[model samples]
Target: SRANDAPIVLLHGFTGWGREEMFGFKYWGGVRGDIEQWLNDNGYRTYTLAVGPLSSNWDRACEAYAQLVGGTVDYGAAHAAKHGHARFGRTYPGLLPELKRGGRIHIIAHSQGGQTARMLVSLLENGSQEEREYAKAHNVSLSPLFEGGHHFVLSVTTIATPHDGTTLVNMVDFTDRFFDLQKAVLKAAAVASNVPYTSQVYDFKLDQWGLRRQPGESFDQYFERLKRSPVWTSTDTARYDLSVPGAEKLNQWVKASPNTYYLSFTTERTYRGALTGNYYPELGMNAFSAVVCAPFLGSYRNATLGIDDRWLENDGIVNAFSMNGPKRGSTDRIVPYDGTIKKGVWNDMGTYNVDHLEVIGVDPNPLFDIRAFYLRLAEQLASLQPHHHHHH
Candidate 1:
C-alpha cells in the first residue's frame, strides 16, 4: 500500500550499531527483531545508519550524509584537522541518489541519534555559514553536508531524545569534578575487568571537541590549537553539547525547517508502584539508568544544582520534559495529536508509559511491539506528500 513512498531511515543512539550489526545484535529493534527488515516487508524502504558512539553531532551528521548522499565518509578537511580525527571513515558500497529517485526520506532517531538527525537537517537546510567560510578559506572540498541539501528529507521523528539536554550530563560533570574517588573506582574496575581505564575515560570526554574557530583566531592558528591539544583527549564537546546550556545553544543554531514534518515521542517510567491505581514519582528505573540517575537524584535530594522536582522524572536516561522537543520554558510545548501532520512545529505524540529502552523494545521484559508502532508511524509518514513547497 505504500510503494513509491519516501523511505524510512532509522538512527541509533549512543553506543549503538548500524547496518553492520554490532556483535550480531540488531540495534534498532534489539534482540526482539530486525526493524529494517520488518519495514521493508511492510512495503516501506528503510536504512539504518551507523555513526560514532562518542563523536560530536556535527561529525556524526557528516557521516550520515556521506552514507546517505555521497556513499563515502569524509569528515571534511577542516573538521578532521580541528578534531585530529581521520578525514575519512567507512565508505558505503553503493551510492544512494539524492532524494532517492524523486522520493524523499523520513528519519526516525532515538536518543543522541535524535540530535544527530537534527544536526543533519540543520546542515542540509541552513548550511553552516561558518563551515562554508572555512572551506573557502582553506581551499578544501566542502563536504556536501554543509551545503543545504535538505530537499531529500521529508520528515523527522525523535524518540526519547533530550532536545534540551539531560541532567545526566550534569551528573557526569559533577562526577568529573569529584574525581579522585571516581577515578580510583574506575581504575579498580579496569584492573578487575582487564579493560583500559584511561581509554574508557577518554571515550567519555571525546565528544567535547569540535571544529570551532575562535574569535580573532587565524585559520592556521586554530588548526595549531587542535593539533596541540592532547591526542585522544580533545575538548569535551559531546558532553557539553548534551548539557542543558549546550543543547540550548545548539537549538538556537539548528531550527526546525518549515518544509519538513516534525514529530516527537516523550517517555516516562520513573514512577512509584501503583497503589490503589494511583502512582507517584519514585527511584524505580533500570539498573544502568538507575546508576546514571543516582548522582543527579542524589544531588537533587541534597538540594544542590537548584534542580527542581520536575527534573526527577526520567526514562532511565532523558527526562520526560527534555524529550518533548526543544525547550521553551520549564517544559517543552506539547503538540496535540490531532491526526494532521504539519511542518516546523513538532507534533507531540504525548508520553508513552515506557522507559527509554522499553520504548525502543530493548528491555529484558519488553512490553511494547516496536514493530507495530513503527509500522503505524511509517504508514502515517508515507501518506504525506513527498515534497514540500520549498523543495524543488
Candidate 2:
C-alpha cells in the first residue's frame, strides 16, 4: 500500500493525548515530540486520534467512530442516561478521509486504546442486533459504527495493551478500600479541573460496550430504571478495565474481526527479585511510578487476586502475559501469540526489553531509539498485504 493510499490512525490509551498538547502535555510521544509527524515525514500517512481519556470502551468507541466517519457523537440515549453522561461528545469533520473514500485504515493503539479498537472493529464488522433494537425503540439513528462499519479497517497493532486485563487494578481497589478521604479529595479536584474523570473502568467491568438491555426489561422502563440509580464516581474506568476479571468480561464480547489483521507487542522491565525471592514487575519503571507501584505490587501478590507465575513479569502498568491476547474460557490460558498473521487472532511481535512509558519515549534513560523503532515498524506494516478471507 502506498504511504498516502492507506492512512494509519494512532489511538491513545487511558489518560492519553492525541497529536496536540492537552492540559500542557503530549500523550503519545511526550517531550520527545509527536510520533505522527515523524511517520508523515518518512512518507507514511498517519494521524493521532483523540478519545475520552477515562470513558468506557463503548463510549470511546462511539466517539471514535463518530470522528472517523465524520459525524456527531451519539452515545445512544439509553446509554447516556444509564451512564449519567452526555448523549454526545466532541466531533470531527472528515477526520478519516480514507474510510470515506472506501479505503482501508491501519490502527496503532496503546494501552486502553487497544481494547477500544477491538470493540470498535467488532461492532463495525458485525452490527449488534441488541443495539439495533435499542435504536429502533428510542427513535434514534444508529451510528454506522454499530451498523457494520468494518469495511474500511485493514489492520490493528497494539502496544502494551492489557488484552486479558492487569492486576494493577487490584491495587486501585485496595487503595479505595483503605483511603476514602484520599479518593474523595482527588475526585473533588478532578471535578474542579473539569478533566475527563468518569468511572469508565466500572463501565467496562459491567460490559457497557455490549449495551444490551437486560432480560425481562421493557424498553420504556430500562432508561427510567437506570436513571433511578446511577454509579457515578471519580474512580477511573481504566481501573476496572485493566483488572484481570475486567478484561476477561470485555474479551467475552469483543472478539477479533476476521477481516482485519492483528498484531501486538508486550514489554517487560521487571524480573524475579533475589532479595525477597518474589517477582517485582515494577522494578524497571521510572522513579515516581515505580514507587507508587511498589506497595500495589506486593499487595496484588498477597491479595485475593493472587499473583501467580503468569502475572510475575509486567511493564509496570500491564502484565506482559495479558498483552499477548485474550484468555481461553475463564482460565489463565491466554491465546498463543506465536503464529501467522491471521485476522481474528493476535500475533505477538515478541517482548521488547523496555518499560511501559519507555515504549513511547517517556523514559528518563531513553534506552531505545524511539524514532528508529517507529520507522522500522511502520515500514513493515506498510509493506504487508491484507487477507481476503476471514480467519476463523
Candidate 3:
C-alpha cells in the first residue's frame, strides 16, 4: 500500500517553536533537531510547524496550521472563534490543495496540537469554513465536524496525549491565575487593540506541557455531547479532569469517521497506586500516582477510552494505558499490551516512555531513542485498520 497523499504535517504542542533555541539550546539532540533531515533520510517527506514560543491560544494558532499546511488560517482574527477555517461552508482551502492534489493528510499532533487537530477535524466535518469563522467570533468551540473528510483522514498519532486534563495543571493552576491577571491587565491597558491574551495558551502552559482546555462543561457532557464543552480548571473539584466519557469521544469519532486510521500511545507511573521508590522529580516520577495518574486515570475513569487493560508503566507523567489504550469495545484505539510488552514488562522500544516534549522532538535528553519511537509510530500509522472492514 502507498503512503497517504498529504505530506505529513507535524503539528507541534502548545507554545512550541520551529527550531527555536529557547530552552537551553534545544537539549533534544540526536534525531530531534534534524527531524526533516531524519525523516527524509529515513524515506519520508516531513513538514514542520511549531505552535508558539510566547503564550498563544489554540484558535489563534489556526494560522500556523494554515500557513504550514496551506489551510485557510487567519491570524488577523483575534481568536479562533472569530474566523475558523474548519467550518461548514468555509472548509480550509489551505488543506484543499494538499488533499485534492497532494494526497491523503495524516495529521500527527502532539499535546495541544492534538486539540488543534481535533478542532480542525471537527470544523471540517460539522460546518463550513464560513460557519466555523462565525463560531470563532462568539468565543465558542466549533461543532463536531468529523463526518466529511474523516474518511480521508489517514492517520492521527497523538503522543502523550493529555486526553483529559493534566494533574500538573492541578499542581500549577496558580500560574494560570497569575497570568490571567496579567493578560486581563494587558487587555484592559490596550482596550482598543485585540486583547493581548487571545487563547488559553497562557492560563495553561499548554505549549510546554501539551494541555488543552475543556469546553466549559462537565466531563460527561463533553464526552456524550460531542460538541463544544467547557474545559476543566484546576480550581474545579475534579483534580485532574478525568472526564471518563470524554476520553472515549476520540474512539467514537474515529469509528464514526472510519477512514481515519487511529494509533494511540501513552505513558504511566505507579504513584497513586501506592508503589513509590527511588524516583526522580526532574524526570517527573515523584509526583506520585496523582501526578502520573493524570494520564491513566482518564482511561480508568472512562470505561470507553479503550486502554489495553494493561496497568501503569510510564516514564513519569502519562501512563501507558492513557497513551495508547482502546475505547469501550473497540481495539483500534489502544495498543495490544502483549504486542509491546516483553515477558510481562513493557519495553521502552515499544512504548517509548520519554517526557511529553519528546513527542514534539524536544526531549533534551539523549536517553530517549526517538528514531525507534517514531519508527514504531510510523509503522503503526502505515498499517492502521480502515473503517469499513472493521469488525468492531
Candidate 4:
C-alpha cells in the first residue's frame, strides 16, 4: 500500500488563529510558534486557517472550505435564514485553489475544530439536501459546497473535541458565552488592525451577521453592536454546537464518510476519588479555563442525557469519553489504533494526562511535547494508504 502523502491543513479550535495574526502567537504551537510551518519545513505540506471562533460548525466549515479551495463564503440561503444571519461571508483567494485537482488533502482539527472538520467532510461527501431542494423551490443559486459527490479531504484528526458534546455546557450558559469569545476576538482584531482600528489582518469572520468592523468604527462601537445580534439566541454558535443536545442534532446530519480516514486524540486531567468515585481536576492544570471548568464536569450526572460517572473523566473542558469520536446520534465505527490506518471511522489515538490547553502547547510548563506529537502524526499521515476500498 502506497502512502497517501496528502497535504495536511490544521484547523484551530475555538478562539484560534491561522498562520498569521494574534500578535505572532500560533494556535497549533502556541508560544512555541507555528507548528504548521514546522511540518512544512520538514518536507511535509501543512497549512493553517482562521475560522469564526464563535460561529457554528456549519459556518466554520464553509469558511474553512473557502480558505482551502478559494471562493466567496456562502452559508446556504436557507441555513442563513434559520440562523438569523446573512447568507454570505468573506471571499478568499484560496489557500489551495488546486486542492482537488492536485489531490485530496487532510484536515486536522482541535476541540471545536473537530466538529467543524467533520461538518466540512460531511458537506463535501453528502451535501445539504435541504439546500438543493430550496434552491429549486426558491429559484436561488446554490454553492458548490451544498452540491454533494465532492471528495476533497483524505483524512481527519480531532484533539480534545467534544464529539458527543461536553457536560460543561449544561453547567454554564453555553450559548451566552458568544459575547465572551467575540469580545476577546474583537479585541485581538483591534490590536492586529493598527492604531486607527482599521485595515485588519485578524478578523472575527462574523460577516454573516454583519459584525465586521466598519471603517472608522471603534472597537467598543463594533463590540456593542455585535453583542446585540440575534446569533446569540439562534443556537447556531460554538457554544451550542459543543453542547450535548446540539452535537446530537448535528450528528444526525454529519457522519463519518466511508472514504475519508479519521483519528482522534483524547485528553484527561481529572482523577477519580477513592470513596466517592467522582473525577476531580489534577493539581496545577495550567490554564484558568481548565481549572475553572473541570469540577463541574467531574461531578456532573444527568441520566436524562445519559451522562454519568463515565462522563466525569475529563481534560478540564471536554469530557474524555466524548473525545473518542462522533458517537451520539451517529453510527460511525470506532476502533482503537493498532499501528494501522482506517478510513471512514475514528481510530482512538489513546489518552493524554495533560489538560486541554497543554495538548496544544499552551501549558506554561508543558510536560508533553506538542511539536513532537504533531511530527509523529504528520509522519503517519504522510505514509497513510488513502485508496483502500471501503465497504458501506
Candidate lDDT scores, in order, read 0.64, 0.64, 0.40, 0.79
lDDT of 1 by residue, 1-392 (tens): 34336788888765465554333446576546778889899888888877665567777787787778656676677777876777777675533565645556899998878888877888887777776888899887776667765677778899998887777766544433223222322232222222322222212222224344345553233334434444213442455566677677778777777777788998887664334222233343444555545335323422454346666567766767678788633223347678876667788877886766666655533466677888998888887764445544
Q: Which of candidates 1 and 3 is the stronger one according to TM-score?
A: 1
| Candidate number that wins on lDDT, 3 or 4 | 4
Q: Give the alpha carbon lDDT tens digit for every residue of 355-378 in model 3.
A: 554444443446666776665555
Off by over 4 Å in 3: 1-6, 20-32, 52-61, 68-96, 128-152, 172-256, 269-321, 325-350, 358-361, 383-392
Question: Model 4, stretches more than 4 Å misplaced?
Answer: 173-202, 213-228, 389-392
Inter-residue clash pairs, candidate 2: 166-242, 200-237, 201-237
What stretches of model 1 exceed 4 Å from their correct place?
1-4, 98-102, 172-237, 272-284, 291-307, 328-334, 387-392
> Candidate 1: how large is its RMSD?
8.5
Candidate 4 residue lDDT tens string, 1-392: 33766788988776686555656666677655578888899888888888887689999998987888898999999898777787888999898876758468888888999999999999998889999999999999999999988888888999999999988788764434434433443342335212335545456677887667678775456555655664445688876788899999988889999888899999998889999878887775754444456777888898999997889999878899999998999988999999877777899989988777777765543567777888888987887885666577
TM-score list, all predictions:
0.76, 0.78, 0.54, 0.90
Model 1 residue 290 CA deviation in Å: 2.8
Evaluate residue 330 in candidate 4 and report its C-alpha lDDT on the 0 to 100 scale: 92
Question: Model 2 compared with the native: what TM-score?
Answer: 0.78
Best by TM-score: 4
Distance from true position, residue 7, model 4, in Å? 0.7
Runs with alpha carbons beyond 4 Å of true place in candidate 2 = 1-4, 23-25, 172-236, 275-277, 281-284, 302-307, 328-340, 388-392
* Highest lDDT model number: 4
